[PDB]
């Protein structure tokens, strides 16, 4: 939906209210998103680690 980024997308267990599209963590980065065509929630995890 215009929000760009990089990472790994995985199936999620969070459950958004109908007026919500993005989810943010404590550092205010987007870590969850609702897919605009299948209406399923996805988690976004960074790629570099270790």
């Amino acid at each position: 939906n215009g929000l760009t980024g990089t990472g790994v997308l995985t199936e999620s267990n969070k459950k958004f209210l109908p007026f919500q599209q993005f989810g943010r963590d404590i550092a205010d980065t987007t870590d969850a998103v609702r897919d605009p065509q299948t209406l399923e929630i996805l988690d976004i995890t960074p790629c570099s680690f270790g």
């Binding site: 969070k14 459950k15 958004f16 919500q20």
Partner: protein
């Protein structure tokens, strides 16, 4: 002839306030605190 019943309503007014809000383990807000409302808060 118009009768009215016995319901009630309540009116309060808003102020610019700073709130501390925790949500839940799954969205939905459980609690929030009003600063400027006691030296404790």
């Amino acid at each position: 002839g118009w009768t009215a019943g016995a319901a009630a309503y309540y009116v309060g007014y808003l102020q610019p306030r700073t709130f501390l809000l925790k949500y839940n383990e799954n969205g939905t807000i459980t609690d929030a605190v009003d600063c400027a409302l006691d030296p404790l808060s």
